[PDB]
Design an enzyme around this catalytic site. Structure first.
Site, PDB file in Angstrom:
ATOM      1  N   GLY A   1      -9.112  -2.645  -2.548  1.00  0.00           N
ATOM      2  CA  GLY A   1      -8.770  -1.257  -2.246  1.00  0.00           C
ATOM      3  C   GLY A   1      -7.290  -1.064  -2.541  1.00  0.00           C
TER       4      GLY A   1
ATOM      5  N   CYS B   1      -3.396   3.499   3.018  1.00  0.00           N
ATOM      6  CA  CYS B   1      -3.801   2.142   2.705  1.00  0.00           C
ATOM      7  C   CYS B   1      -4.713   2.116   1.489  1.00  0.00           C
ATOM      8  CB  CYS B   1      -4.470   1.457   3.908  1.00  0.00           C
ATOM      9  SG  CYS B   1      -4.510  -0.362   3.685  1.00  0.00           S
ATOM     10  N   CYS B   2      -5.988   1.820   1.688  1.00  0.00           N
ATOM     11  CA  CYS B   2      -6.911   1.704   0.570  1.00  0.00           C
ATOM     12  C   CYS B   2      -7.809   2.890   0.333  1.00  0.00           C
ATOM     13  CB  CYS B   2      -7.862   0.517   0.771  1.00  0.00           C
ATOM     14  SG  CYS B   2      -7.081  -1.092   0.845  1.00  0.00           S
TER      15      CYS B   2
ATOM     16  N   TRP C   1       0.836  -1.201   0.000  1.00  0.00           N
ATOM     17  CA  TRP C   1       0.000   0.000   0.000  1.00  0.00           C
ATOM     18  C   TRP C   1       0.875   1.258   0.000  1.00  0.00           C
ATOM     19  CZ3 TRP C   1      -1.415  -4.125   3.168  1.00  0.00           C
ATOM     20  CH2 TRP C   1      -2.620  -4.766   2.812  1.00  0.00           C
TER      21      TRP C   1
END
Ligand SMILES: CC(C)(COP(=O)(O)OP(=O)(O)OC[C@H]1O[C@@H](n2cnc3c(N)ncnc32)[C@H](O)[C@@H]1OP(=O)(O)O)[C@@H](O)C(=O)NCCC(=O)NCCS
Ligand SMILES: CC(C)(COP(=O)(O)OP(=O)(O)OC[C@H]1O[C@@H](n2cnc3c(N)ncnc32)[C@H](O)[C@@H]1OP(=O)(O)O)[C@@H](O)C(=O)NCCC(=O)NCCS
Ligand SMILES: OC[C@H](O)[C@@H](O)CO
Ligand SMILES: OC[C@H](O)[C@@H](O)CO
Ligand SMILES: OC[C@H](O)[C@@H](O)CO
Ligand SMILES: OC[C@H](O)[C@@H](O)CO
Ligand SMILES: [Mg+2]
Ligand SMILES: [Mg+2]
Ligand code: NA
Ligand code: NA
Ligand code: NA
Ligand code: NA
Ligand code: NA
Ligand code: NA
Ligand code: NA
Ligand code: NA
Ligand code: NA
Ligand code: NA
Ligand code: NA
Ligand code: NA
Ligand code: NA
Ligand code: NA
Lengths: 759, 759
Positions: free
Chosen positions: B734, B418-419, B333
């Protein structure tokens, strides 16, 4: 709620009570000890094994004293409860076993407190530190010392450098914690671990409900660490061939188990004071049971006590030369509180009270353990006289006021930590604060915050006092101002120190031997009380003229006229000393503290009287720049000139009510001033202490008394011929030291103190 | 207040403002970037050096995918910012340098987070851990993992074991922190260190005055650690031959300096998500200046971007097989937020927005960095179409709603961690919470708290629902009850985790690149939303009959009648999903949190859809025991059967207002359903996203969209012949993964998801 066989066997014959269903050592003692009102005639002498062992260890002690350095120390092992293999003096002879490292007097590395101090010790004593230890404790495991220095303020650093607030626990273990080591003997490790898991579990609801969230998480982690330390204690004992999972079943095991609890503490923490507690009467319960059963003889009982006490004489920690200046004489403060009276009026003196004192005869005088007599006017006369005799013969004991402290706590199971600081065993501890320089603070008031030696602005910028003659009201008003500033800087430094010590060197093995919730006080000490009181007295009653340099800085003083000095029972100056104590207590009381530890005060210095004295210039009382202050609450050197009763009276006036952390007084009297012969001396010394400690509703009494019975001529002989006095011990500030363990400068302080020449 | 020569030279030509007098990256960007409304026609292709470098690295990637294990990893070095020597792919060719260890793709040991996980990885990948590392991180330096497990409750452990609350950050770095790496380029390390000392000093008054004492001490220590980490960053960069004491002076240095800030983060912390930030437009300021000066060519600019992005494709962390199940595909990520619009209405799209997307052509498709388009209906059409084309060609991008998030923050300098979790750069972070199993929680409501697989009482003892037909009102009332319990256990676990992560693995190098006071949210995720919504829908609109075992436990269900399923724009079930989101948010909002971090929610699962699905039995919606839940907020596999507009509409209805941590939707459409040819596909995809993200006062719009443009037949070919698709990348929750990096079980989840066949 169901004692397994281990408990059954161990507790056979003991009177039942709450102590069998919950951890409650005081209840066990109350229901089982045997008060002893007899004399010392039953005492046995040393066994051949004891003498062989101690004589061998004394060779290491002599080496330490002559070199003023450790016999040896680790350079590549980080000490923990289980790091070291079993060590012995002579395994075939020892009745009570256990050493910090694998060899007698070899000192450990306890890095959690700081790596720079270890580097300093290695350099000072010419040993090379293993690079791996330095790396681990610089990059992987942060230390207490580095956490503190990362958060200190420039102001605190200036105070440290200038000698107004120096020697605080930012570079050594804080100490002032006494785990209840008796719990190991009474219950065994498994029972204590089960009790700790229950304490941990009792905090689950608050955790889940968000009640004091961070405090709850912190305490749960601390209890988990305590539980882990208890398990490690079992492993440590197993290295010595003992299974301490269950309770001690006889006297030898009770003494051994209690010592193992303490051994885990001194293998894992290097607190300045690692005190032993109030164990002699507790241990008497087991000794008495074995004697009555014919399992052991009195000489065997004395031997076990001797071997335990011998191990307390062998506790050592690697310290830097800086630490040695602040805490002289290679001290440990393995303090043992003896005797006292119970809340029910019975004496807590036991035959074991006599056995502990007897170690000063079986193995000669020794500064450790720091044997402390809890004095009461109601103690059996037989014991009062024997303790007095031991003081006369060895100058190795101190006395503290049980008639004052027991009622203050409404508790008869409190012990003394370090020198004079009481705590209910297993329920209370102190956050150690060392001491502040009150004398220099007064100079700052006169000099507008500018240091008289460094010529640097340390205190807040203020207008220096003008005029050719100092005025008491003016000086006192400015001094009060600087005491406010001092209190704030002091409490701020201690808040940082104790937050960091809890974070980076939490004393898990000692805390594991306390209740879930421990009462904490923030102990603030004051150094130079008599210098400050006498300075105010000179200003108030004589004519003090400042001698200023080209900058207006008062660097000396000329005094016209005589003035009353503290220690002569003259209220004019004694009232000033009492006022200073009350005044500082009220100021620290207003400040917020870490963990809401209750501020307390002590009039105590250890060797900061020399260190602060060296960093303090000429004072209004006439003391010269660089000269030592008096130790603790003592009158300045040689100023108490009216005799013992007068100086004891002045000191007893200092208020314990405003100095709950203790008030230290070092009293030295020449033999012939004390009495014409031995019997008279014993009677007179007991009489002097009864008067000093006398307590009633309207009279507090003194709190502490170190007693030396010696001629100054003898100390001078020891300074010239140390080899003639290898075990010569002297009380110096609330603890004792072998005279030969001091540096020459420290000996000069001691030999110029007051040797009382009359009543 | 006086820029030295270093700043002068570096900032020549830049528009002046607050950014020159205080750390303020947003102000610098606003005053200096050049909006770009043109198309992709100016883009250059890869240089020979870029291709030589990437082709070599891809051999390591293929090895990782075929072995499903690291190429190599340390077994005897604890990683820190300065532990490793400089490492290269080919030093003669790299324009932007820096690797985590001394070799490409070799993974480090980051022990502060936990030693048991490292032991687990060594066992799993057949390497032997150095005994010294195990010893240090068991006895000397306690780890985050052990601190958490020392304080957890039996209840939390049961939830972890049963699959109702599993995969939380108790065994890996929490991540969700984005230091502003751009600060290193803009200011240089020395300026940032001076600013941190000022921040530290600004806390002195509160410290001295006892204001929020513990919080103040904690923050001062954190700032001291941040300052120390900045110094270490300089040493790290020097190993590579760079002096980063001063600000970057050109494009290559701005890219290199920003990357070095990130490199220090990934050398010292192993957060699950180590996101890059919002850097492309910031970097364009330096690239544009150099292009206009004729210092570099466009191909040279693309090459520097390519080498930076190539390093982001090489970030790796040693993970356990357990972690691999929860976070599949070897994810990092390294999220980069591209484009968006400014508060002033100008687009923040720059030529560099195009250069970053172009890396998917110069070096082919890749899952990292996780390139995230901040979409606005007002973005230049040229950019909307190019991003759509890149999605069609590579399926490597995701899109998030700038028209929703920028106004929510009233800020145009937020990035995605992250997502789908937004944060204002350098001013905010999240305390990561992974996600809870909402579907199993519903079964607990029906089964009185007893786990359907373990037959153990996990939730509070409650009366299981009786009857042959489930009633919606009854089930929902019990479910609400168990959601209260779930929220309390969840927040309690997170309170422990974040207290311990702050204590034992504080992210100093990342926090050093944030303001003094950072806003923290406590991010709680929910998994199985569509399984729960569809289960409630089946119960409400059809006839669901529990199939019980000999204990009354509902282990299966029979459904009579059809019922509406989430993802078909049927309000009957979509309203149930919206309600569940609102309901859980309101429950966590009532609870006390560590550091007063504001609770937020995300509908996000990563691979917990597979892990929780494996641990969850048959549910009322008809899903079979062990089957995966949908990823994030997705309709369950194959249930959205009415086309793209209908499923996008259902998902857009989920309220960002009650899920501020993000709402993940993975959309896969077959090429011919999207459009008849390339141009039509680009136009139609941009049109679909404009509609999905459409925002006005009365319409929130969707928050996130992963876009895959592929035929299922192609993925089946890749499952059979992985060697033919070494760089095949697919969006999965994601973030993206190389399809070959997944286990067969994870590929089966992916291939059975919905492949949208119509608008
Ligand atoms: C190194 C530091 C202590 C200042 O050093 P300095 O300018 O040499 O300070 P001082 O002159 O007051 O000397 C520090 C004294 O503490 C002693 N010391 C003990 N432990 C120490 C430690 N961990 N670090 C530094 N000094 C230490 C030094 O040896 C010295 O003793 P001395 O006066 O007998 O020679 C620095 O860490 C500091 O200013 N800390 C305050 C907090 C701070 O600024 N934190 C970082 C904020 S971003
Ligand atoms: C060891 C401990 C976790 C309980 O162990 P247990 O009875 O085996 O617990 P569980 O059955 O729930 O298993 C623990 C799980 O966490 C995993 N784990 C991860 N880190 C761990 C760590 N540091 N310690 C223990 N387990 C750990 C275990 O491998 C296991 O995973 P699994 O379910 O996939 O096999 C114990 O430390 C504990 O009960 N802690 C709670 C707090 C506590 O009691 N503290 C001491 C108070 S005095
Ligand atoms: O090097 C940075 C570390 O956090 C150090 O400060 C403690 O080990
Ligand atoms: O290390 C021992 C000390 O240096 C000494 O002062 C003790 O008497
Ligand atoms: O290192 C952390 C351990 O828990 C230590 O404190 C006891 O061994
Ligand atoms: O260590 C690498 C992981 O095992 C693999 O799942 C990544 O694709
Ligand atoms: Mg210094
Ligand atoms: Mg387990
Ligand atoms: Na001797
Ligand atoms: Na230890
Ligand atoms: Na320890
Ligand atoms: Na706390
Ligand atoms: Na108070
Ligand atoms: Na008194
Ligand atoms: Na008398
Ligand atoms: Na390839
Ligand atoms: Na590091
Ligand atoms: Na670290
Ligand atoms: Na705090
Ligand atoms: Na809230
Ligand atoms: Na919405
Ligand atoms: Na459309």
């Amino acid at each position: 709620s169901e004692l397994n066989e281990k408990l059954a066997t161990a507790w056979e014959g003991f009177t039942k009570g709450d102590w069998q269903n919950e951890v409650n050592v005081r209840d066990f003692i109350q229901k089982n000890y045997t008060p002893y009102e007899g004399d010392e005639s039953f005492l046995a002498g040393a066994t051949e094994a004891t003498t062989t062992l101690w004589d061998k260890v004394m060779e290491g002690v002599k080496l330490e004293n002559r070199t003023h350095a450790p016999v040896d120390f680790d350079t590549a092992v980080a000490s923990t409860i289980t790091s070291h293999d079993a060590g012995y003096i002579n395994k075939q002879l020892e009745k009570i076993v256990g050493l910090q490292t694998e060899a007698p007097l070899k000192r450990a590395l306890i890095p959690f407190g700081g790596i720079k101090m270890i580097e300093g010790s290695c350099k000072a004593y010419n040993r090379e530190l293993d690079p791996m230890i330095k790396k681990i404790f610089t990059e992987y495991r942060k230390t207490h010392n580095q956490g503190v220095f990362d958060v200190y303020t420039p102001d605190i650093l200036r105070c440290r450098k200038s000698g107004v607030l120096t020697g605080l626990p930012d570079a050594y273990g804080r100490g002032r914690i006494i785990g209840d080591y008796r719990r190991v003997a009474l219950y065994g490790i498994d029972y204590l671990m089960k009790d700790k898991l229950a304490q941990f579990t009792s905090l689950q609801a608050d955790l889940e409900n968000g009640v004091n969230l961070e405090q709850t998480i912190r305490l749960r982690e601390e209890i988990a660490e305590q539980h882990r330390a208890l398990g490690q204690m079992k492993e440590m004992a197993a290295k010595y061939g003992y299974d301490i999972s269950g309770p001690a079943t006889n006297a030898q095991e009770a003494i051994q188990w209690t010592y193992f609890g303490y051994l885990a503490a001194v293998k894992s923490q290097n607190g300045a004071a690692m005190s032993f507690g109030r164990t002699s009467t507790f241990l008497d319960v087991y000794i008495e049971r074995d004697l009555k059963a014919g399992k052991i003889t009195e000489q065997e009982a004395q031997e076990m006590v001797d071997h335990l006490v011998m191990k307390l004489r062998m506790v050592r920690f690697l310290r830097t030369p800086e630490y040695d200046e602040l805490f002289s004489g290679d001290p440990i403060w393995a303090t043992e509180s003896i005797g006292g009276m119970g809340l029910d009026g019975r004496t807590l003196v036991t035959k074991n009270s006599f056995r502990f004192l007897n170690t000063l005869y079986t193995m000669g005088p020794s500064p450790e353990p720091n044997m402390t007599i809890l004095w009461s006017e109601k103690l059996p006369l037989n014991f009062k006289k024997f303790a007095a005799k031991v003081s006369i013969d060895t100058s190795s004991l101190q006395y503290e006021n049980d008639d004052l402290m027991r009622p203050d706590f409404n508790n008869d199971d409190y012990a003394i930590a370090c020198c004079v600081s009481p705590m209910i065993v297993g329920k209370q501890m102190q956050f150690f604060g060392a001491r502040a320089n009150l004398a220099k603070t007064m100079l700052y008031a006169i000099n507008g915050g500018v240091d008289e030696k460094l010529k640097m602005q340390v205190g807040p910028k203020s207008e220096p006092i003008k005029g050719d003659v100092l005025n008491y009201d003016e000086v006192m008003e400015r001094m009060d101002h600087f005491m406010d500033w001092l209190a704030k800087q002091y409490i701020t430094a201690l808040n940082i120190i104790h937050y960091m010590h809890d974070k980076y060197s939490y004393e898990a093995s000692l805390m594991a031997l306390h209740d879930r919730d421990v009462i904490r006080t923030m102990a603030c000490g004051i150094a130079g009380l008599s210098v400050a009181a006498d300075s105010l007295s000179a200003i108030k009653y004589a004519k003090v003229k400042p001698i200023r340099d080209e900058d207006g800085l008062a660097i000396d003083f000329e005094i016209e006229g005589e003035y009353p000095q503290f220690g002569n029972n003259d209220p004019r100056v004694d009232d000033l000393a009492v006022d200073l104590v009350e005044r500082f207590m009220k100021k620290i009381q207003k400040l917020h503290t870490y963990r809401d530890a209750i501020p307390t005060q002590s009039v105590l210095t250890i060797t900061s009287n020399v260190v602060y004295g060296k960093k303090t210039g000429n004072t209004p009382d006439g003391r010269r720049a660089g000269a030592p202050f008096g130790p603790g609450a003592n009158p300045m050197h040689g100023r108490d000139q009216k005799g013992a009763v007068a100086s004891l009276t002045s000191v007893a006036k200092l208020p314990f009510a405003y100095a709950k952390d203790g008030i230290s007084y070092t009293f030295s009297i020449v033999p012939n001033a004390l009495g014409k012969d031995d019997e008279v001396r014993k009677t007179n010394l007991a009489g002097l202490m009864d008067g000093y400690f006398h307590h009633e509703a309207s009279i507090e009494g003194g709190q502490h008394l170190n007693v030396n019975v010696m001629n100054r001529e003898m100390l001078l002989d020891a300074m010239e011929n140390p080899e003639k006095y290898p075990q010569l011990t002297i009380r110096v500030s609330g603890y004792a030291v072998r005279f030969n363990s001091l540096t020459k400068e420290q000996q000069q302080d001691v030999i110029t103190r007051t040797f009382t020449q009359s009543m």
